[PDB]
Amino acid sequence: LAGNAARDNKKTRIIPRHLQLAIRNDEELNKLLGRVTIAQGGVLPNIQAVLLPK
Amino acid sequence: KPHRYRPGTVALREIRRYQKSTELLIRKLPFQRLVREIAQDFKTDLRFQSSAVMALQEACEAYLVGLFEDTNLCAIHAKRVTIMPKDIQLARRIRGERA
Amino acid sequence: PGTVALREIRRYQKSTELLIRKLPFQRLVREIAQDFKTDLRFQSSAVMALQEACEAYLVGLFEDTNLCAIHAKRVTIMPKDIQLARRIRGERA
Amino acid sequence: VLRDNIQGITKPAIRRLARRGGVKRISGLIYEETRGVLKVFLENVIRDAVTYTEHAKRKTVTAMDVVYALKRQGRTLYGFGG
Amino acid sequence: DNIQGITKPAIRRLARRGGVKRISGLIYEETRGVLKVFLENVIRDAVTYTEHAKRKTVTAMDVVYALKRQGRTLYGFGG
DNA sequence: CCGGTGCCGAGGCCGCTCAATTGGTCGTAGACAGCTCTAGCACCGCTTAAACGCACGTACGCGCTGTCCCCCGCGTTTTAACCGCCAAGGGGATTACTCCCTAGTCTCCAGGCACGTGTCAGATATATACATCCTGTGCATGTACTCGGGATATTGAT
């Protein structure tokens, strides 16, 4: 999954960002790794529906 | 005369810009000085590894980001978009820290 | 009105018994456990511990739900509060 | 009648639990939702309690099994063994 | 006095990663409290681990062990 | 014409009169104290044997310590969408009543599986000689960060 994410990012080297994306996007891996934080991995992009403009 | 942006669009611009990158926000030197002074307040004449302080920084940033995400949920629950401290207190209490 | 409810509120916060009838809880537990494996037998203390833990969980959940409802300048609790409490505590999303 | 036993958790029981929690008013849509929540909890304990029964090659679920199952979920229970 | 080293734009940036549009002006002074308290626990452990090994330097593994005892696990620092 | 004055209407005081609350007494019954072995059994006393824990030097890097430069923070301005307050319509959760019904008690019955012991055998600790897989070191090069300039959006004001 990390390699798939890195390919989607159009780069051939896996960095912590790809691992973070792979963990968070997959439900089971996120459930397993719920209480762990990936160093310099950030957070998924998310905007609440009510916060969008008109 | 100069082109002015609406109040709120720059907010989402900054949201999108920061939610993609993964750099450290807090300036390194103030954080190091803060942790050094706290440590001396506990135990004087201490030495810190740079990796240790950067790991403290990353843990603190992750904690703050999660706290602010919960605060955002609390604020939206109250039919609002501005975050006030009562939202933070509610989140902190339900998580089970403060109370 | 609005004071007979507070009578209950004060009464139940002192007494310490099981607020769910035992037989329906036993039937529920047996039916839930049927899927994992057929033809099981249950220790009575196991059922009692299950019911005690579930009641404690529900009481804590409703405490947090009441805090959520008070936050939004309301007195009535709605599922919009339970979902928020579960989300921010960490059992969902 | 052929009725699911989740509805055996009667509405007055849920009201009693809520009143023990300290709530004045109860909307009408809580009653179906809470049962669902009560399902999920029992789906995360009995599942564990059966597994221990598997590992001991036993056929009767004991109180120690459920106490250990609750212990690993950060919900330790006192006074029922262990 | 160094808690003021956590400038206001830094708090704004941290909030912006979380996904919030508007920030009250009195949030910072309370938020600096949370940073003040959450950081006062890991150090409690971090120095204490250091004080068990007869050494007086806080290595990068003590903070990992503290955060693990508290329930927040991090990767990439020798965990 | 206006004004004194009686009649009536309303506001203020005081007090029971009565209906709902809560600590005190009676009483009986299953369950906390408390021997009684027992029982065998962990705990203690009394020995040695081996190793890990501890301290002394000593080599050797990774934290503190001093100097230039801009990038981010500070501070100001205006203004506008949001917060907070207020008010009214109405739905629905509340409260109380009668009626139904399955929880709760306990009694009786009985066969399934917890639970312990006894037997024995093969899976696993352990020691020694063999050897090769992983690890520190060294080094070529290329994927990726950075700078610069031209596409395509992407918002705001007429």
Swiss-Prot record, chain A:
Oligomeric and partner information: The nucleosome is a histone octamer containing two molecules each of H2A, H2B, H3 and H4 assembled in one H3-H4 heterotetramer and two H2A-H2B heterodimers. The octamer wraps approximately 147 bp of DNA.
Post-translational modification: It is involved in the initiation of both imprinted and random X inactivation. Ubiquitinated H2A is enriched in inactive X chromosome chromatin. Ubiquitination of H2A functions downstream of methylation of 'Lys-27' of histone H3 (H3K27me). H2AK119Ub by RNF2/RING2 can also be induced by ultraviolet and may be involved in DNA repair.
Protein's job: Core component of nucleosome. Nucleosomes wrap and compact DNA into chromatin, limiting DNA accessibility to the cellular machineries which require DNA as a template. Histones thereby play a central role in transcription regulation, DNA repair, DNA replication and chromosomal stability. DNA accessibility is regulated via a complex set of post-translational modifications of histones, also called histone code, and nucleosome remodeling.
Originating species: Homo sapiens (Human)
Family label: Belongs to the histone H2A family.
Residues bearing PTM N5-methylglutamine: 40
Shown residues within the full chain: 66 to 119 of 130
Sequence positions bearing N6-(2-hydroxyisobutyryl)lysine: 10-11, 31, 54
Name of protein: Histone H2A type 1-B/E
List of residues that carry N6-crotonyllysine: 54
Modified residues (N6-(beta-hydroxybutyryl)lysine): 31, 54
Residues bearing PTM N6-succinyllysine: 31
Location of the protein in the cell: Nucleus; Chromosome
N6-glutaryllysine modified-residue sites: 31, 54
From Swiss-Prot, chain B:
In-chain residues carrying the UniProt-annotated modification Phosphoserine: 21, 50
Modified residues (N6-(2-hydroxyisobutyryl)lysine): 20, 28, 43, 86
Subunit relationships: The nucleosome is a histone octamer containing two molecules each of H2A, H2B, H3 and H4 assembled in one H3-H4 heterotetramer and two H2A-H2B heterodimers. The octamer wraps approximately 147 bp of DNA. Interacts with TONSL; CHAF1A; CHAF1B; MCM2 and DNAJC9. Interacts with NASP; NASP is a histone chaperone that stabilizes and maintains a soluble pool of Histone H3-H4 dimers.
GO biological process: chromatin organization; epigenetic regulation of gene expression; gene expression; nucleosome assembly; telomere organization
Localization in the cell: Nucleus; Chromosome
Species classification: Eukaryota, Metazoa, Chordata, Craniata, Vertebrata
Location of Phosphotyrosine modifications: 5
Encoding gene per record: H3C1
Modified residues (N6,N6-dimethyllysine): 43
Shown part of the complete sequence: 38 to 136 of 136
Entry-annotated residues carrying Phosphothreonine: 44, 71
Residues modified as N6-crotonyllysine: 20
Name of the featured protein: Histone H3.1
Natural source organism: Homo sapiens
List of residues that carry N6-succinyllysine: 20, 43, 86
Function of the molecule: Core component of nucleosome. Nucleosomes wrap and compact DNA into chromatin, limiting DNA accessibility to the cellular machineries which require DNA as a template. Histones thereby play a central role in transcription regulation, DNA repair, DNA replication and chromosomal stability. DNA accessibility is regulated via a complex set of post-translational modifications of histones, also called histone code, and nucleosome remodeling.
Predominant subcellular localization, coarse grouping: nucleus
Curated annotation (Swiss-Prot), chain D:
Residue location of crosslink Glycyl lysine isopeptide (Lys-Gly) (interchain with G-Cter in SUMO2): 11, 39, 59, 71
Outcome when changing residue 11 to R: Abolished ufmylation
PTM sites of type N6-butyryllysine: 11, 24, 57, 59, 71
Record annotation: effect of changing residue 11 to T: In TEBIVANED3; results in early developmental defects when expressed in zebrafish embryos
Compartments where located: Nucleus; Chromosome
Residue list for modification N6-(beta-hydroxybutyryl)lysine: 11, 57, 71
Reported impact of residue 20 to L: In TEBIVANED4; results in early developmental defects when expressed in zebrafish embryos
Mutagenesis or variant effect for residue 20 to H: Found in a patient with a neurodevelopmental disorder; uncertain significance; results in early developmental defects when expressed in zebrafish embryos
UniProt keyword terms in alphabetical order: Acetylation, Chromosomal rearrangement, Chromosome, Citrullination, Disease variant, DNA-binding, Hydroxylation, Intellectual disability, Isopeptide bond, Methylation, Nucleosome core, Nucleus, Phosphoprotein, Ubl conjugation
Residues found modified as Phosphothreonine: 60
Residues modified as N6-(2-hydroxyisobutyryl)lysine: 11, 24, 39, 57, 59, 71
Post-translational modification summary for this protein: Acetylated as part of spermatogenesis progression prior to histone-to-protamine exchange. Demethylation is performed by JMJD6.
Modified residues (N6-glutaryllysine): 11, 39, 57, 59, 71
Record's GO cellular component terms: CENP-A containing nucleosome; chromosome, telomeric region; extracellular exosome; extracellular region; membrane; nucleoplasm; nucleosome; nucleus
Cross-link (Glycyl lysine isopeptide (Lys-Gly) (interchain with G-Cter in ubiquitin)): 71
Domain of life: Eukaryota
GO function terms (MF aspect): DNA binding; protein heterodimerization activity; RNA binding; structural constituent of chromatin
Effect on the protein of changing residue 71 to Q: In TEBIVANED1; results in severe early developmental defects when expressed in zebrafish embryos; results in defective cell cycle progression when expressed in zebrafish embryos
Residue(s) carrying N6-acetyllysine: 11, 71
Family membership: Belongs to the histone H4 family.
Protein name in UniProt: Histone H4
Lineage: Eukaryota, Metazoa, Chordata, Craniata, Vertebrata
